[PDB]
Amino acid sequence: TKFPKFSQALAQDPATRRIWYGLATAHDLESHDGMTEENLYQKIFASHFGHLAVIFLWTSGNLFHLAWQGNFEQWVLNPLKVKPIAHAIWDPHFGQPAVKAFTKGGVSYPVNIATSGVYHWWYTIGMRSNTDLYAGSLFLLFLAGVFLFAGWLHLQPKFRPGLSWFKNNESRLNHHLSGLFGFSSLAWSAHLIHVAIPEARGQHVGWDNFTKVAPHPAGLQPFFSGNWGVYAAAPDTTNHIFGTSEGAGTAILTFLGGFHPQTQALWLTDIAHHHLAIGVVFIFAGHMYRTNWGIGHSLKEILDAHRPPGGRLGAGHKGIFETLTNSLHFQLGLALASLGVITSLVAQHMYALPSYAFIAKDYVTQSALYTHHQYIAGFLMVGAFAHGAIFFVRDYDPEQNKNNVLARILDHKEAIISHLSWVSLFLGFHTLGIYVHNDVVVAFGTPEKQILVEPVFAQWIQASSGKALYGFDVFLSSSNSVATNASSNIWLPGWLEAINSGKNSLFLPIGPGDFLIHHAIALALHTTTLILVKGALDARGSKLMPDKKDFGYSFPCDGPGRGGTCDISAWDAFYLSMFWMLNTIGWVTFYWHWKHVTIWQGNAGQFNESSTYIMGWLRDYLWLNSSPLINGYNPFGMNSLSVWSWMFLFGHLIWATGFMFLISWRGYWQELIETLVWAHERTPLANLVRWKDKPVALSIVQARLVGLIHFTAGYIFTYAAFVIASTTGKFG
Amino acid sequence: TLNLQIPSPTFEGSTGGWLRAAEVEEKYAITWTSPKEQVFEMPTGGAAIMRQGENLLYLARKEQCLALATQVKNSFKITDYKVYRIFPSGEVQYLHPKDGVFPEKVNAGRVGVGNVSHSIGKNLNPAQIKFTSKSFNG
Amino acid sequence: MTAAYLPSILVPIIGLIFPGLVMAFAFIYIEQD
Amino acid sequence: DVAGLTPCGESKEFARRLDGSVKKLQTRLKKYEAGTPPALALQKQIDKTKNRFDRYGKAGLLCGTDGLPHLIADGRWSHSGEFVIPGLFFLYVAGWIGWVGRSYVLFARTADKPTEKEIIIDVPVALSFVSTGFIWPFSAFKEFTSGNLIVPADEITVSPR
Amino acid sequence: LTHGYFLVGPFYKLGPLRNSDVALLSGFFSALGLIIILVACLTIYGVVSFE
Amino acid sequence: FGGRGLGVTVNAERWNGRHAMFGIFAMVMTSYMKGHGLIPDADKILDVAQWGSLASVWDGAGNGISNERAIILIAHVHVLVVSVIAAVAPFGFQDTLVKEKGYTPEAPAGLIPPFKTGLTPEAELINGRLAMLGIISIVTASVFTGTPVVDTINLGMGKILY
Amino acid sequence: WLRDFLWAQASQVIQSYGSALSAYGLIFLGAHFIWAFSLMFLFSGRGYWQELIESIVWAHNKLNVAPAIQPRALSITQGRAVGLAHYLLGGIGTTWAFFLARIISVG
Ligand code: CLA
Ligand code: CLA
Ligand code: CLA
Ligand code: CLA
Ligand code: CLA
Ligand code: CLA
Ligand SMILES: CC1=CCCC(C)(C)[C@H]1/C=C/C(C)=C/C=C/C(C)=C/C=C/C=C(C)/C=C/C=C(C)/C=C/C1=C(C)CCCC1(C)C
Ligand SMILES: CCCCCCCCCCCCO[C@H]1O[C@H](CO)[C@@H](O[C@H]2O[C@H](CO)[C@@H](O)[C@H](O)[C@H]2O)[C@H](O)[C@H]1O
Ligand SMILES: CC1=C(C/C=C(\C)CCC[C@H](C)CCC[C@H](C)CCCC(C)C)C(=O)c2ccccc2C1=O
Ligand code: SF4
16 A cells, blocks of 8 residues: 555554545645655745636636637626626436526526626726636636646755755745735736726727727826826716726826715725725835845844834744744745735725625625635635644744744733633623623513614724714714814715715614624634634643644644543644634624625615524524525426525535534444444455455544534535525525 | 474353464464363453363463463463464464563563663654754753 | 537546446455455 | 714604514503413513613613614723723622632632632632622732732743743 | 346436436446546556555 | 557557547548438437427527437447457457556667568558548638538548538 | 424513523523534544644643543544533533523413
């Protein structure tokens, strides 16, 4: 058996555990036999190339499947009535009524209705026909092939980079900030000015004419003259019909603010100046570090020099440079945390300030996008903490970090965990007490006895942004404030028009239910942070197991001795925190979907009166919106929601299956497999057939992971089916 | 040496006995002497009656043999038991007691295997021994 | 749908022939000594 | 008023809530004979509902558009009895409770067998301790400043870092 | 012969084309596909099991 | 893989050449019958109510596979069943598809094998390579012009078939 | 089963608020709470809770309020038993409230 060629210990396993553990440790290159650091970095570089190629192939596949089987050319003409098609259906297990019921979108074959929002994004950036969609798919296929060839090439001899090249922090930071962030943003601003804005104004720009069709009538002469404000003159009129010249302006760079009154999305000129400014700022950031020419900053000197002289941080940040450069897991945790924060930021800011034309009226698409990127955010943050725990297990050198900030985290880890526990118990005790209190007093016929705290802090913030609903009369809601007079000539009219109109999701009105659900969200975030931080900081050892770092990041237990040591590793803390992450994104998406459905229905008072107690959530959101989902198929017929009606139940099945690997444990199943081995060995006409690997029960860590996987898949598929089918049944 | 001609305890048979891996990979044997014919519990499930005199028994695992040895030690005061490992080629490897003296009693000539010359809290952190074949013990 | 024969050609291939050969060859690879 | 809310004593939807509750209790009252104990119980429930709505309307509570009282908790004194002053009452009691429990723990260490004191409470000594809690902030602060509340880090067990 | 002979029956009697005029042809073709799958199973078993 | 006669081996080239000669024959005979109208109900659309959901193609008119395409596919299914049975249960005298691990590989014939006319393996390999090259050329001439493959074969043969 | 039995007949227990059967709805929610609380014992293990109890013991040691009886996490068998007991209580109480509210309302 030589499948796990990277592990001799796994390859000598005589049982079925070998295949599973080779599958689960295949990409754990640091644990492989005889792995050196240079080989590790080169394999990581090529794997990153392969993932980039996979992303490009997926995007090219989306573009191609739309150019072939979509209705983009029909959808551009009538964006607010035509249902967008994701891809075609060819399933031979279908009966005829299922073929009939999925034939939508103005085509003659069964199709799925798109929820990804690629129509609005591609239409906003200037694609109009199916031809350029196919050309973009071809370009991304070619780009993916180029990156596959680069991944092969940069592993070939005399091209394999050295460890000094990989650990060049200053050069990589300068090039990735100035070029990968800055010049990419400048080029996207260029694409918006040169292509997207003219196509938004009904004038065709492609590769055949973009060198002869000026983005602005005055050309680049106002840019080279320093009369840049000429590019701000004659913006798009409030009567502008998107994709046509009727009411179109000539400006290419404005900061008008608010939304286009027809598309209910941000002005494209604002997006172009934003990405231009982001490019300029990032190129200015990308000249900061010294690479070859004496000027620039040194990262080691900046880290060592910022030690506060009062001694409250100890030695400050001395040794953090080598600890960060030498540990890929510390870097991975930092990157995953920052990525999770910004995809949460994307999820909040894109529903609140949409940039794609007509996507604010596509309720299913907004729900799917928010839910998707928020679940991605939870996964990324959990991964950040998990790989930080791996950094403490594998890479943390105390002797290189004497009196460091990391060492001082470790020296007051008990205070951190105890105060996290205190705030988690505080939040849970009083939030659950208010919710149960409201339930009990509403059930007894006295809703006037509820404890309803007005969220005056966030309402004050909304008034500071210009919301005149609450009468706070402060900052942008004050017509005499210095901020109001400062911004009155630039952006205040459009922003005030967008924030004080109740037709969008810009700073939606909030009440006691919003207060309670944000404090529940704070409870869940603090508790997940408690589990993850306690796992990371106790990863090296505890009072029950002071030599945990000798046993690695993942192991089942330390035996029944010393009272019992079940789930003591930091991997087990990851495993416990995954449920709480699913709970937190569940609460967030429940709040988002119920509030947005009640506003879209014109029945926001139902949310305002029912969200203060749990029975309102169970009845008016879960039970009430389940009716089109559970009627996707029935004894009277079926319709297009039936697949979600299947998938919903599918989730309710697979979620439950996870429980069996999380409740029942190993020895029972192992003895059953002994009985099955005896049965197969003693049965005639079947003992002629022999297994090559001995059948064994799944290991403890493997069973925890498999139960987690079935649980998580059920969670995701159940909520996705519910949100899409419910939004479609109410609004589509 | 293992005498293959030692008679076995009287057993009616069970489904818990050794599988094909005993005749293919390895098998274990336990011998002991009893002062009388008496009923004992099989480690694979069931009751057997051991004869007066010598008894030879075959098992699939060493732990089953040592469980039987512990059972007859604490219930019948039998300490002369010997456990052997038998391969399909017929080579017999004596296992327990390895030097004739039980492992809980000190015997001369035994050498310490796996002994570490410091406390467990003096083990190395993984960061010293990453990308290096040095042991965590030092 | 232009080239409508392609779904009916490729979906049975991708869904039954590709996984069967992948499972067979992966089985052969992981069980061989 | 605060945050665009209206006082409950002039809110028409607060009156609609009161009227709906009164009619809901009165339609149950209609099915019973006058003088029967269910009729008296229902009339008492009506009286409690009217008194509660009257008391809530004259208290300066703010009502939202739902028709329920909304609490203000930003620190302003005009609603200082809605969160700040009851919370201090809890702060009075809870700081009491822990302190007397802490005192009992310091007593229990001095006994011959502490764990028997832990499971079997010395009731006179515990009653003395629960009497001591009425001046708990000043006593706790003097315990803190004399170095008898906080122990140094070198006398507390910690795991290997 | 025995197993392939009895494999025809359930596919003919219970398949999705059982109420059509080509029920037996579809059932035999499905049985042949199952036979080919089992032959592939035999082939990979013999490849991995014996030297 | 390579030790069993699979991959770039002389056996695999010979087998693909044999299959390519048969493919040239099948395309020519298909073109001859399709030009001459020997396919009964060639434009008949197969109905889902008889043949099930596998007959769905989802084109713009009829939404069913034509009867002619089904007849061509069933003709191929016959020789696929023959292929499977010959691959698993070959004749004792027949050349086998997969070879044993300790087999002797046939020597590569280079640019051109020795000119042995008749039912010799050299002539078989020469027409097999010729048939593979002809299939490549026919495919390229079909996709660079828009001419259908049957019509391309008829034009390259000078309208002999029809 | 999901729609015509579970979804359909639970209308009575979730609209019982403000009526005499509202206690069943409260119990319905409470059983829904406790059963989920049971999974915290069922899915987790002793070592995590023992180390968290170590941190809480450090917190109580900082204020010199550590008890003489050393707090330990519940045993593995006790963890299984507590999770099973709260699971059974939650499920039986949920079915209890749902059945009783439905059959009192419609029968
Ligand atoms: C200017 C030169 C330049 C540029 C452009 C890059 C570019 C890149 N390098 Mg890099 N590199 C450079 C110089 C450069 N390098 C130098 C000089 C060195 C040596 C010191 C290295 C050493 C190096 C290593 C060692 C690695 C890379 C990697 C990467 C890739 C990161 C993955 C990726 O695509 O993220 C794309 C990222 C961006 C486009 C910017 C970040 C985007 C953020 C999240 C904001 C975007 C939000 C926005 C609203 C989304 C809009 C889109 C939405 C509509 C869908 C990327 C292609 C990694 C890789 O994958 O290798 C193949 C890697 O491991 N580089
Ligand atoms: C009236 C209804 C009500 C009810 C039933 C509860 C119930 C509870 N509260 Mg609570 N609380 C309420 C209203 C209520 N609260 C209000 C209105 C406030 C605002 C002032 C608070 C503020 C509050 C805090 C700040 C804490 C609680 C805690 C608790 C829990 C433990 C009780 C306790 O203190 O242990 C008995 C006391 C001890 C065992 C030791 C004494 C510790 C006390 C709390 C210190 C008080 C003095 C200290 C100097 C003040 C520090 C507060 C500072 C951080 C702002 C319990 C479930 C505690 C908790 O959840 O723990 C995580 C907790 O820390 N509550
Ligand atoms: C609804 C289910 C539920 C509930 C209520 C809890 C509750 C708790 N979990 Mg938890 N957990 C759950 C499911 C649940 N878990 C699941 C499914 C998992 C995945 C395995 C986890 C994983 C998990 C981890 C990994 C951690 C927790 C932690 C916590 C505690 C702090 C969080 C909090 O809000 O404190 C507030 C506490 C509550 C709201 C609990 C309810 C308190 C009750 C209502 C008080 C009244 C009791 C009542 C009077 C008793 C009378 C009964 C008698 C008559 C018989 C708390 C005890 C963390 C912890 O211990 O932090 C200190 C921690 O580290 N849990
Ligand atoms: C990852 C991207 C992706 C995905 C999920 C799909 C999904 C689908 N395609 Mg599609 N396709 C894609 C890219 C993709 N396509 C690209 C780039 C092309 C251009 C060559 C096509 C061309 C295409 C045709 C012509 C047809 C489909 C069809 C289908 C459907 C049936 C599956 C099938 O027969 O595949 C067949 C797909 C191929 C033969 C092309 C391979 C797909 C790309 C190139 C590979 C991507 C792999 C990925 C990056 C790595 C995965 C690793 C691991 C997870 C396995 C299904 C909805 C069929 C359909 O319409 O049924 C209704 C059909 O007839 N596809
Ligand atoms: C994406 C993959 C995929 C595809 C393309 C199909 C396609 C089909 N399934 Mg299906 N199926 C799938 C996945 C898939 N299934 C999965 C995952 C399951 C498990 C839940 C099932 C369970 C299932 C059942 C239980 C049944 C079908 C049936 C059918 C057929 C529909 C009825 C009909 O007209 O056929 C008429 C039937 C035929 C024309 C027989 C086709 C025989 C093929 C062509 C022989 C090929 C053998 C093999 C692939 C050769 C290569 C071997 C190699 C892989 C080792 C159709 C061919 C029905 C059927 O008729 O099957 C008998 C049926 O009863 N399926
Ligand atoms: C003598 C009582 C006492 C005191 C003063 C403290 C003090 C403290 N505890 Mg602790 N605790 C206690 C009992 C006590 N504990 C008991 C009995 C339990 C088991 C339920 C806990 C469980 C516990 C947890 C799980 C946590 C704390 C935490 C804390 C700290 C913050 C305050 C807090 O969260 O309170 C909240 C207190 C509770 C939730 C439990 C209180 C239970 C009752 C109400 C107190 C016992 C009163 C006692 C019976 C009176 C008898 C005396 C009489 C004979 C005179 C602080 C060091 C937290 C921490 O680490 O913060 C830094 C934290 O996470 N404690
Ligand atoms: C555990 C593990 C061990 C070691 C490795 C590891 C990776 C380090 C770690 C994992 C760690 C975790 C994951 C670390 C990652 C952690 C979390 C996610 C950091 C969140 C930071 C939020 C910043 C401070 C800002 C908000 C904006 C502020 C400045 C604004 C104010 C203002 C701005 C200007 C604008 C307007 C708003 C107002 C308020 C007016
Ligand atoms: C001491 C140094 C002072 C500053 C020096 C650098 C100033 C900026 C230099 C810009 C680059 C050179 O600019 C030179 O080529 C440009 C492109 O053909 C010309 O620009 C012209 O053509 C462009 C392309 O059609 C049009 O969009 C412009 O509206 C038009 O003015 C400039 O009129 C010319 O001066
Ligand atoms: C939460 C949890 C614990 C922690 C439970 C603690 C250790 C015991 C809690 C008992 C409390 C103290 C008694 C009842 C709580 C009352 C509501 C308030 C306490 C009253 C005090 C005066 C005692 C485990 O020990 C455990 C063990 C094995 C698997 C899973 C778990 C597990 O999930
Ligand atoms: S029950 Fe399982 S996880 Fe717990 S100590 Fe025993 S073997 Fe380890």
